[PDB]
Design a protein around this ligand. Structure first.
Ligand SMILES: C[S@@+](CC[C@H](N)C(=O)[O-])C[C@H]1O[C@@H](n2cnc3c(N)ncnc32)[C@H](O)[C@@H]1O
Ligand SMILES: C[S@@+](CC[C@H](N)C(=O)[O-])C[C@H]1O[C@@H](n2cnc3c(N)ncnc32)[C@H](O)[C@@H]1O
Lengths: 92, 76, 99, 108, 83, 326, 88, 98, 93, 108, 328, 76
DNA sequence: TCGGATGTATATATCTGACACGTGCCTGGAGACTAGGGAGTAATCCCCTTGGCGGTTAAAACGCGGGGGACAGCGCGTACGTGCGTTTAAGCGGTGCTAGAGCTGTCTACGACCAATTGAGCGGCCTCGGCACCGGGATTCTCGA
DNA sequence: TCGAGAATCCCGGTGCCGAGGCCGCTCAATTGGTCGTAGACAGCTCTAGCACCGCTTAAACGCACGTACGCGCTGTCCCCCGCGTTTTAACCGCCAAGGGGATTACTCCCTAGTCTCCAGGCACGTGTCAGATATATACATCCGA
């Protein structure tokens, strides 16, 4: 029983381009993309908690790993997107 | 009566059946004697893909019929 | 009367031909034999999923295409149009492969 | 007891917070994982996948198609300046290359 | 059963075709033996790493993930085969 | 043992104590009084020729009797042209806003008497919203000449610091009332002295300013939700506030009326904002963002030009969207 | 008074013309065009502004106001430039 | 009077500095450069003195390695003087000019 | 508190190889940076092999193949023989 | 009870097996660490440090010194072909560069 | 319905059954008998002219009566020069070692009759010491001409495979007795047929070989510790043995006497071995390692040239070390 | 009697001592009243670096003497 | 090829502060034991890798020609090196100051763990529309006049 | 320049298979508690980062001159591009066989965790030698002749 991000990539695509599909070969590339930047961010957040003698990865380690890894204006809009999610999560 | 349930591997058994038995009851008795889970089993009856809702009598299925077991698995 | 193009016309037509497509440019069965004889250096019986030979080919295409892009810049730098073997050697030197 | 509501819905996300949380605990990254850490990470992964599918759907429209092909992902990444910095060491299968001819090579 | 002289299967038209996706419009005749030598050094390094991943998994078949893992630890990461 | 001036309109003029307290290591409140004279020497285009014989770029300014000079010709020799007040002439009507030459001088002067120790402004928690920085006179002058405040606008500086930004806007704009809020107690303590010293040096030249108020408190409070929405133009210096307190301000700005101007260091909306079904609730839906012209020496913490942004609220972008939905 | 920060202004000049030569002499170059010195101050301004900013933000994450020798190592070693001798 | 031909003393300076390991940039002009790039972060920063030496050891190693690749791009064009298009060609092949 | 380095152990190896030479304290700090760097490369690669093969333990089989992945040609050949010679002596004692 | 004998001595090593074992358990590499895994790793680290100190002591002798300087580590690494492949992305502080002049630049 | 030959010295000659069993898809035991005749056609420099009229490079070899031809002139026409045995002539004295032309032919012939299914040799656990590979005739001929075996040496092939390496050494070297051990049961089963067929085709030509023995068993056993140390020259094909069973062999090789030759695929000692206080116990202390000249088609699993190594034990390197211990 | 134990910080106490007290007994009484561990304490007595083996009387130490506490720590 | 001159290696005095040795202590590594679960191993199943075969035709190879680009030589002018004299500011050393890194001690709130529940996501399934391919339509582009 | 001709875009048509939607059914995520320890926070200590002084002199700066190198131009010439045939073998579709990847079950042996114990390594003190420096002499390099 396998699993992938294919259900969730197809949901985001219908929000952006509501009448547009995606090839199964192109969906396999988007799974490789999400898995790449998962363990790219999570590997850097793991080193930040180890450099500072902590044992917990919090959303503050995730935030400054985004700023290290993403370039320029992607890092600005990924941080304002990630903090918007956390405030809606902890109020609701 | 009985039916001949042949597999794709060359294995033919004798499954003693009833007209009131559903396809779910057919897929429950093979595991009782062989051990194959019922999400892997299909019966070739003149090429028709059967459905677990109705019985054998609702498809003009004669006794001593040759049913070929199509073995599918849970993914690709 | 055998109408023929001037040299460089068909070559520029082939730049546009192959920078528009996405297909593999090496023949597949001669590439697969090259993979199976480099693996003869080990011993012995290796079996190579067909998806793995396609993954090696797609990576060897992208290596060589991106190496001819840097080779081309080294020939323009020397005010030439032909690429020459000393342009591949310079490009791999600065890239950190030839050393 | 109360009706089950997913962590993605109360965060307002499309990506799964509960699956991201499982992969952080499974992956040997730290001894312990905070509560808001998979919420923050799933929002960033959903943002970045919406940036590529934005640009790749625009490339699919310019070539008069209605599906996204690996060529359209390649054109989306290499034409955007900051997606080219992330994915600069990445090769995309059946993606091709950008059409680019050096101006010296053109006739006259 | 011994398989030999297979870089010559990478022909002169194939190398010329890779150069024109790279944007090269004129090619000297000595390019073709240089390109076969650069390609053999590249494939030998990736297959050496892909075969030592399938030693450790105790297999016989080199899978597509062994190639994706081998390319990833050379900085040449590759999408579309299961990474 | 002291020296004193006279107010050219009539008030309690100027007490300059003994030996010229420290403004820096090398100018030590010298060169400031002789530049104060040069602005009373205008508008009044009389003292350029009337004191042509006496004033100079002279030496010997470290003594006292030479500092008795250049004010004795102010404590006495201003009276020979002051005297003509009988019947036909009053000196000035008070309805004159200062030009950008002497308003720079008044704001530079009021800073020196008020901020006694500018290194105490550096006491903050690092990388926090309480880090301190100032905006130069040249950019606030640019900011006024881009927002074009009419007679019915309200100006609020969110995090006004010591408060020099609301003083320039209160002296160059005819609006009703201006506000500045400040949480941190060290620049809010200097803001009280800056408030007092501004009004007395602005009555000294006899120039008109608008009304203003410098307050303490947090703008992230329930009191400030209503009165952010009731103001026309907002200046905020959000360069190191962070993403959490910028996310808070984006949902206070969603209540402002039409034509709401917002000037900030970092933009609250991207410059190329595309609207789709994923960012409908965003603040960038309802505002247009342009970048102001960057000028040299714009901020106080660095030398390279930092450019600010202008936000203009018009809720028609979401009315030009929802016009292609079917 | 004046002022809360004294701003340092040019400081790339700084890296002087006889110091860009003698860096080119360890590189082994024999002759240098006159336009190299402005080109070599744009590079070293792009570099060393990417190392700082990634040295800070390791300092910010530690809440620490003083960028140490580590965080420069770890800034380098993140750009693929491991530095020995300071050091991890 | 005696006068060396041009190129003689330049080759003597190759041997002079490839033999030594000293820092080639002055230290106080470099430290002053570091502290004014750090002014772009608003807040006050301190720079432990071992961190300014780590940045200078890293910046000089970058520039020396960039002039080795620049020198190979000038020899490739049958020149002896290096030139700004050799730095630009070296940084594009290396992957930095983007 | 106190510290931990490899300076006791780098010095013992130096006295076995060149028993008459010494080492400065700035070259000793470069050898500590080297040992910590190669430790992180090998232990990081061996951690990644166990996750690929769905194992939860790092054994000496995975340290061995991480050495083959990371070290170049003849260095990888002699580091494997020095590693197996140590493990076989350890298991017999 | 029996006399304590270190794991480095029964392996025949100079590097500490017990400290390497602690750093593998501390470092979040896996859930579990085998018994011979720190023995194998400490032997490889001791081998590689003996290869550099072999070559750096030879460079220190050629320059007529009796101590090893960071220059001698730089000359040892860059003159050996396989140590240059490991440490090719590594800069050594106060290490300098190899003396190398291009043959075109030499007179006549 | 069959065909048969005659032994030119006198023994049970040759049974070649009907239709020429499969050696490959396209040569099918044809072309082999006509090359077998060409070596009896020499040394004996008589049949080159005596059958000049009849033998040819003719067509029509798929039939039977034409295969009755080219042996009827062997089952009958050899007798016209055989006949002269009376009184003054015996054909050959048995003390002749074959030249490298027909020994290649005898070893190629004995391989085809013995290994009936060469694809069964590929049944092994992968990347294990039991992987199979062969060494070509040209490299074993190089190996003999570099070790220079005297009259008092012992040869052991560790992991002899099917056993073709000890057969070439037993037919080109005058030593006492030669050994080959093999653990895996599939090439050890072909080694028994290879043993039988070698002796009968070597008596057929009337050529002399040394004595040899092909055995089963593990060379990592207690029996083989003593008899590794008692042999002068050792061949081992350790290309995919691995580091564990190479570490085992390095402490069996430490007991060999002086002038012990060891030939291997991968070297047991580095080519540039420096001795210091850290590697005194190593096996490279006591042996000199040289690389043999690489030749094309040297091994059986690949086409590129694999070069072997020569180890020579002399315990004087550790006696030229310990001669500088108190020089400074 | 008593001695004046001044620190580097400007803090001077009155430690009532005996001639038979060792330097270990001096370093044990400061922690009893201040709390500084005895691997951090030195006594300037005409510049001399004292040793924990002997007493105060074996150094010609007079009562009401000015001893300057040199504060070292456990590393650099 | 030869000669005056500057540079660089060789040799001797001399001196300091940094490396190497010794000592005391303490905390982290070793020894011994239990408990349980990860991985070894054996058995089974079926996907998928390998091999072969034949026909067709796309592509490779060598048919073979000539234009254009590489390369060498030459001449001119300018820009870079060398060197000398002046000027700036680095570097050293020293003192002084405080702030902030680093540490310790409480204590609390957050996260791991567990069990019960249940709905989202996965697998299988039919189906239709996008997309590929097609012939024949029109439009542009290169090249010799 | 303007026809001639080969390349390419453009416009309907056919068809086919892969995407996208439906449905049933887990099993993984969620809800609700408990527990204990990680980390937050306050308070303290004291190193080291910062600022400033004066002085000496090393290095930077500016200038001048000549020459060597860059660069533009010309000319030869050979090598690379191009297009039609007789040549090779890739590609495709098909069948066939069996190794080997993948799963499941049993179970044993290896590792985590515990407590106790103790000696190795770390800090501190110390002493002396190696290397930096200065000086003088000696030989290799450079450049005019
Ligand atoms: C960068 S200063 C700007 C000073 C002034 N606006 C100027 O430009 O001259 C920002 C100020 O905002 C203040 N601040 C930060 N957060 C605040 C809040 N939540 N409520 C009120 N003031 C706040 C801080 O004290 C800081 O002094
Ligand atoms: C590569 S084959 C060499 C065959 C033969 N030496 C040749 O070159 O023609 C190596 C053989 O050694 C055998 N082998 C491996 N380990 C062995 C052992 N421990 N004892 C005996 N034979 C062994 C294997 O069966 C394998 O067939």
């Amino acid at each position: 029983r396998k699993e992938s991000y294919s259900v969730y990539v197809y949901k985001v695509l219908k929000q952006v381009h509501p009448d547009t599909g995606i090839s199964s070969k192109a969906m396999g590339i988007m799974n490789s993309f999400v898995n790449d930047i998962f363990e790219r961010i999570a590997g850097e957040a793991s080193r930040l908690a180890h450099y500072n003698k902590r044992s917990t990865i919090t959303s503050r380690e995730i935030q400054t790993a985004v700023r290290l890894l993403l370039p320029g204006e992607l890092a600005k809009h990924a941080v304002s997107e990630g903090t918007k999610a956390v405030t809606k999560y902890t109020s609701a | 009566m009985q039916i001949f349930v042949k597999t794709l591997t060359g294995k033919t058994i004798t499954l003693e059946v009833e007209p009131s038995d559903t396809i779910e009851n057919v897929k429950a008795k093979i595991q009782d004697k062989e051990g194959i889970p019922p999400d892997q089993q299909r019966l070739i009856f003149a090429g028709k893909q059967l459905e677990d809702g109705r019985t054998l009598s609702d498809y003009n299925i004669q006794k001593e019929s040759t049913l070929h077991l199509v073995l599918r698995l849970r993914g690709g | 009367k055998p109408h023929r193009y001037r040299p460089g016309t068909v070559a520029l037509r082939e730049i546009r031909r192959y920078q528009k497509s996405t297909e593999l440019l090496i023949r597949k069965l001669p590439f697969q034999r090259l993979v199976r004889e480099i693996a003869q250096d080990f011993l012995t019986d290796l079996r190579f999923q067909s998806s793995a030979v396609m993954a090696l080919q797609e990576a060897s295409e992208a290596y060589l295409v991106a190496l001819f892009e840097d080779t081309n810049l080294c020939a323009i730098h020397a005010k030439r149009v032909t690429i020459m073997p000393k342009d591949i050697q310079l490009a791999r030197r600065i890239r950190g492969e030839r050393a | 007891r109360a009706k089950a509501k997913t962590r993605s819905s109360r965060a307002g996300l499309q990506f799964p917070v509960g699956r991201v949380h499982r992969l952080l605990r499974k992956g040997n990254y730290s001894e312990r994982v905070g509560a808001g850490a998979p919420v923050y990470l799933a929002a960033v992964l959903e943002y970045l996948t919406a940036e590529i599918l934005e640009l790749a759907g625009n490339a699919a429209r310019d070539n008069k198609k209605t599906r996204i092909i690996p060529r359209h992902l390649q054109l989306a990444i290499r034409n955007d300046e900051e997606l080219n910095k992330l994915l600069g060491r990445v090769t995309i299968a059946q993606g091709g290359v950008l059409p680019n001819i050096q101006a010296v090579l053109l006739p006259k | 059963k011994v398989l030999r002289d297979n870089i010559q299967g990478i022909t002169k038209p194939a190398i010329r075709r890779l150069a024109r996706r790279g944007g090269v419009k004129r090619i000297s005749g000595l390019i073709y033996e240089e390109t076969r030598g650069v390609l053999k050094v590249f494939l030998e390094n990736v297959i050496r790493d892909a075969v030592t991943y399938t030693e450790h998994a105790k297999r016989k078949t080199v899978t597509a993930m062994d190639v994706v893992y081998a390319l990833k630890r050379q900085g040449r990461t590759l999408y579309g085969f299961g990474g | 043992l002291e020296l004193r001036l006279k107010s050219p309109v009539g008030a309690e003029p100027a007490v300059y104590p003994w030996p010229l307290p420290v403004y820096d290591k090398h100018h030590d409140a010298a060169h400031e009084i002789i530049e104060t004279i040069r602005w009373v020497c205008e508008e009044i285009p009389d003292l350029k020729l009337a004191m042509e014989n006496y004033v100079l770029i002279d030496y010997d300014t470290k003594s006292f009797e030479s500092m008795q000079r250049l004010c004795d010709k102010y404590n006495r020799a201003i009276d020979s042209i002051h005297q003509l007040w009988k019947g036909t002439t009053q000196p000035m009507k008070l309805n004159t806003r200062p030009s950008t030459g002497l308003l720079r001088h008044i704001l530079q002067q009021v800073y020196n008497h008020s901020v006694t120790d500018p290194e105490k402004l550096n006491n903050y928690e690092p990388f926090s919203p309480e880090v301190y920085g100032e905006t130069s006179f040249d950019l606030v002058a640019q900011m006024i000449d881009e927002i074009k405040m009419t007679d019915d606008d309200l100006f609020v500086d969110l995090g006004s610091g010591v408060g020099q930004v609301v003083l320039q806007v209160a002296a160059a704009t005819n609006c009703k009332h201006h506000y500045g809020v400040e949480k941190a107690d060290i620049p809010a303590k200097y803001a009280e002295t800056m408030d007092r010293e501004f009004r007395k040096w602005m009555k000294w030249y006899g120039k008109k300013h608008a009304e203003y108020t410098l307050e303490r408190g947090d703008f992230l409070s329930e009191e400030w939700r209503e009165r952010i929405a009731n103001t026309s133009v907002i200046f905020v210096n959000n360069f190191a506030f962070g993403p959490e307190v910028d996310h808070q301000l984006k949902e206070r700005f969603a209540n402002m009326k039409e034509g709401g101007r917002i000037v900030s260091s970092k933009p609250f909306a991207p410059l190329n904002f595309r609207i789709n079904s994923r960012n409908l609730s965003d603040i960038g839906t309802i505002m247009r963002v342009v970048e102001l012209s960057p000028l040299k020496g714009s901020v106080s913490w660095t030398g390279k030009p930092v450019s600010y942004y202008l936000h203009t609220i018009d809720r028609t972008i979401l009315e030009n969207y929802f016009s292609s939905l079917k």
